[PDB]
Amino acid sequence: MIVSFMVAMDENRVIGKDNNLPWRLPSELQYVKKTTMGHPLIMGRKNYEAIGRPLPGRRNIIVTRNEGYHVEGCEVAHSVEEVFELCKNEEEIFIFGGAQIYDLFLPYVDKLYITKIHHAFEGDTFFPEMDNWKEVFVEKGLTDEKNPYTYYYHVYEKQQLVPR
Ligand SMILES: COc1cc(Cc2cnc(N)nc2N)cc(OC)c1OC
Ligand SMILES: [Ca+2]
């Protein structure tokens, strides 16, 4: 099962503030929605609560220590093992939100769906750093009136290597 990340980022690798996104990008969010369509959404509790509601078209799997955490139209996992368990028959998943959720799926990550907004915002949350990788795709995001920022979509798959 392909373990993919889906993050929208910043100049300073900002991916949030008190809980929500510092930017308002309906186009970006559409590219997000389309890309992950058909695949589960792996996201932490405070993250999903930022999102606000179950994103349709995909298994909404949530992560939390809380054994007694439930939320309608959503699956909940207390372990990475329990996510891999749930998504055992999945061809690909998308790690979505919570900087600490990334660090849990870090050891397994396969593909990186990183958006980079060319600005410096004020944010509390940030994205863990990484050493590789290998960019396979790149496209600029639509800067409109409703997308008042310049940002590009960046895809990264693991860098191979020629046997010594
Ligand atoms: C509904 O779509 C949302 C998705 C996300 C997570 C997320 C969304 N897109 C990308 N590219 N990376 C992410 N980590 C975060 C959100 O706010 C926290 C969303 O809306 C509220
Ligand atoms: Ca893997």
Tab-separated table of C-alpha atoms and ligand atoms in Angstrom:
chain	number	residue	atom	x	y	z
A	1	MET	CA	0.000	0.000	0.000
A	2	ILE	CA	1.393	3.376	-1.100
A	3	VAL	CA	1.747	5.642	1.936
A	4	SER	CA	1.344	9.218	0.626
A	5	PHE	CA	1.471	12.579	2.392
A	6	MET	CA	-0.850	15.416	1.452
A	7	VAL	CA	0.286	18.736	2.835
A	8	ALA	CA	-0.164	22.344	1.839
A	9	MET	CA	2.875	24.270	3.053
A	10	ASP	CA	4.500	27.699	3.384
A	11	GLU	CA	7.739	29.604	2.806
A	12	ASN	CA	8.569	28.712	6.392
A	13	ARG	CA	6.847	25.334	6.109
A	14	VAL	CA	3.738	26.630	7.906
A	15	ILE	CA	0.760	24.248	7.744
A	16	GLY	CA	-1.517	25.925	10.281
A	17	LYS	CA	-2.013	28.294	13.188
A	18	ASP	CA	-4.145	27.777	16.284
A	19	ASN	CA	-5.791	24.998	14.273
A	20	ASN	CA	-6.840	26.192	10.809
A	21	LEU	CA	-5.061	27.169	7.570
A	22	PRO	CA	-3.517	30.670	7.310
A	23	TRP	CA	-4.528	30.824	3.642
A	24	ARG	CA	-7.842	30.485	1.823
A	25	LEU	CA	-7.330	28.554	-1.407
A	26	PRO	CA	-10.502	26.978	-2.966
A	27	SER	CA	-8.503	25.917	-6.038
A	28	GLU	CA	-5.783	24.272	-3.976
A	29	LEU	CA	-8.472	22.560	-1.912
A	30	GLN	CA	-10.084	21.333	-5.137
A	31	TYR	CA	-6.771	19.869	-6.357
A	32	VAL	CA	-6.560	18.260	-2.949
A	33	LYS	CA	-10.080	16.880	-3.178
A	34	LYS	CA	-9.546	15.430	-6.668
A	35	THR	CA	-6.129	13.898	-6.013
A	36	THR	CA	-7.133	11.957	-2.914
A	37	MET	CA	-10.542	10.929	-4.325
A	38	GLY	CA	-10.907	7.173	-3.908
A	39	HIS	CA	-8.313	6.888	-1.158
A	40	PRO	CA	-8.609	7.100	2.665
A	41	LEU	CA	-7.792	10.313	4.548
A	42	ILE	CA	-5.419	9.788	7.456
A	43	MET	CA	-5.648	12.746	9.808
A	44	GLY	CA	-5.423	13.493	13.526
A	45	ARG	CA	-8.275	14.652	15.754
A	46	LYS	CA	-7.427	18.352	16.141
A	47	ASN	CA	-6.762	18.351	12.406
A	48	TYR	CA	-10.142	16.888	11.414
A	49	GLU	CA	-11.726	19.333	13.844
A	50	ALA	CA	-10.010	22.114	11.941
A	51	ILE	CA	-11.393	20.652	8.713
A	52	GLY	CA	-14.796	20.672	10.390
A	53	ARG	CA	-16.546	17.877	8.512
A	54	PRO	CA	-16.125	14.487	6.760
A	55	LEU	CA	-14.685	14.960	3.279
A	56	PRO	CA	-16.864	12.697	1.076
A	57	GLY	CA	-15.649	10.231	-1.564
A	58	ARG	CA	-13.034	8.626	0.684
A	59	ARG	CA	-12.633	6.703	3.944
A	60	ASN	CA	-12.258	9.341	6.651
A	61	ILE	CA	-9.888	7.646	9.096
A	62	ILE	CA	-8.981	9.583	12.248
A	63	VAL	CA	-6.154	9.048	14.738
A	64	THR	CA	-6.262	9.622	18.501
A	65	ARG	CA	-5.088	8.050	21.758
A	66	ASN	CA	-8.655	8.431	22.995
A	67	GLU	CA	-10.077	4.901	22.939
A	68	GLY	CA	-13.542	6.376	23.383
A	69	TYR	CA	-13.470	8.802	20.490
A	70	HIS	CA	-16.246	8.499	17.931
A	71	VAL	CA	-17.492	10.763	15.147
A	72	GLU	CA	-20.193	10.143	12.560
A	73	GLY	CA	-19.329	8.951	9.059
A	74	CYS	CA	-15.751	8.357	10.153
A	75	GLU	CA	-13.452	5.506	11.125
A	76	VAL	CA	-11.065	5.979	14.045
A	77	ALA	CA	-7.654	4.402	14.632
A	78	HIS	CA	-5.472	4.552	17.757
A	79	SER	CA	-2.305	3.241	16.117
A	80	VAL	CA	-0.426	3.455	12.844
A	81	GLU	CA	-0.764	-0.323	12.978
A	82	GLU	CA	-4.529	0.105	13.205
A	83	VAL	CA	-4.519	2.405	10.196
A	84	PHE	CA	-2.346	0.005	8.198
A	85	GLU	CA	-4.779	-2.563	9.517
A	86	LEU	CA	-7.835	-0.677	8.262
A	87	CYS	CA	-6.173	0.331	4.994
A	88	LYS	CA	-4.734	-3.142	4.512
A	89	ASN	CA	-6.610	-3.644	1.217
A	90	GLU	CA	-5.942	-0.058	0.114
A	91	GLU	CA	-3.757	0.680	-2.908
A	92	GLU	CA	-2.800	4.076	-1.485
A	93	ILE	CA	-3.556	6.290	1.492
A	94	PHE	CA	-3.050	9.984	2.211
A	95	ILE	CA	-1.571	11.250	5.467
A	96	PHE	CA	-3.307	14.587	5.777
A	97	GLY	CA	-2.870	16.627	8.942
A	98	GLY	CA	-1.262	17.032	12.318
A	99	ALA	CA	2.496	17.544	12.361
A	100	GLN	CA	2.771	14.653	14.799
A	101	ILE	CA	0.728	12.372	12.561
A	102	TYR	CA	3.317	12.894	9.843
A	103	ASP	CA	6.072	11.829	12.266
A	104	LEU	CA	4.128	8.621	12.920
A	105	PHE	CA	3.860	7.740	9.223
A	106	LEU	CA	7.257	9.220	8.432
A	107	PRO	CA	9.021	5.815	8.687
A	108	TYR	CA	6.677	4.449	6.019
A	109	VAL	CA	5.975	7.390	3.710
A	110	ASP	CA	6.216	6.654	-0.001
A	111	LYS	CA	4.990	9.724	-1.864
A	112	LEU	CA	4.871	13.406	-0.930
A	113	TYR	CA	2.050	15.598	-2.185
A	114	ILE	CA	3.406	18.966	-1.079
A	115	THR	CA	1.892	22.319	-1.958
A	116	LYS	CA	4.118	25.346	-1.339
A	117	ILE	CA	2.590	28.810	-0.988
A	118	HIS	CA	5.285	31.406	-1.778
A	119	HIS	CA	4.492	33.557	1.251
A	120	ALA	CA	5.431	33.945	4.902
A	121	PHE	CA	2.389	33.659	7.175
A	122	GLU	CA	1.914	33.697	10.932
A	123	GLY	CA	1.294	30.116	12.048
A	124	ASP	CA	1.605	27.927	15.129
A	125	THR	CA	1.842	24.532	13.409
A	126	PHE	CA	4.651	23.573	11.014
A	127	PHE	CA	5.779	20.686	8.793
A	128	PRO	CA	8.547	18.254	9.844
A	129	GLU	CA	11.756	18.554	7.822
A	130	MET	CA	13.004	15.917	5.367
A	131	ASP	CA	16.252	15.175	3.527
A	132	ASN	CA	16.340	12.773	-1.850
A	133	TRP	CA	13.691	13.236	-2.513
A	134	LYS	CA	12.646	12.888	-6.148
A	135	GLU	CA	10.237	15.227	-7.896
A	136	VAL	CA	8.031	13.552	-10.485
A	137	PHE	CA	5.452	16.321	-10.956
A	138	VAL	CA	5.147	20.108	-10.645
A	139	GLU	CA	2.367	22.576	-11.489
A	140	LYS	CA	1.541	26.140	-10.501
A	141	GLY	CA	-1.672	26.783	-8.570
A	142	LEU	CA	-4.282	29.154	-9.982
A	143	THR	CA	-3.807	32.658	-8.558
A	144	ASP	CA	-7.229	34.343	-8.759
A	145	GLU	CA	-9.185	36.731	-6.569
A	146	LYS	CA	-10.321	33.796	-4.462
A	147	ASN	CA	-6.793	32.420	-4.586
A	148	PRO	CA	-4.830	35.584	-3.606
A	149	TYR	CA	-1.465	33.820	-3.458
A	150	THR	CA	1.165	32.221	-5.674
A	151	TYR	CA	1.669	28.527	-4.964
A	152	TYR	CA	2.786	25.393	-6.824
A	153	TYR	CA	1.829	21.722	-6.512
A	154	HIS	CA	4.885	19.520	-5.857
A	155	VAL	CA	4.975	15.722	-6.071
A	156	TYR	CA	7.840	13.583	-4.774
A	157	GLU	CA	8.481	9.859	-4.959
A	158	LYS	CA	11.384	8.100	-3.241
A	159	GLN	CA	14.789	8.448	-4.900
A	160	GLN	CA	16.084	5.070	-6.066
A	161	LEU	CA	19.822	4.381	-6.452
A	162	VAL	CA	22.245	2.409	-8.629
A	163	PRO	CA	23.736	-0.632	-6.832
A	164	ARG	CA	27.354	0.048	-5.839
B	1	LIG	C1	-11.419	20.354	3.439
B	1	LIG	O1	-10.040	20.254	3.057
B	1	LIG	C2	-9.112	20.523	4.031
B	1	LIG	C3	-7.965	19.735	4.024
B	1	LIG	C4	-6.958	19.918	4.965
B	1	LIG	C5	-5.685	19.053	4.953
B	1	LIG	C6	-4.864	19.260	3.670
B	1	LIG	C7	-5.522	19.668	2.519
B	1	LIG	N1	-4.861	19.855	1.394
B	1	LIG	C8	-3.542	19.655	1.325
B	1	LIG	N2	-2.914	19.853	0.171
B	1	LIG	N3	-2.859	19.258	2.408
B	1	LIG	C9	-3.491	19.057	3.575
B	1	LIG	N4	-2.792	18.665	4.635
B	1	LIG	C10	-7.115	20.897	5.938
B	1	LIG	C11	-8.257	21.691	5.975
B	1	LIG	O2	-8.344	22.642	6.956
B	1	LIG	C12	-7.646	22.223	8.137
B	1	LIG	C13	-9.269	21.508	5.019
B	1	LIG	O3	-10.396	22.284	5.025
B	1	LIG	C14	-10.823	22.768	6.295
B	2	CA	CA	6.045	2.074	2.502
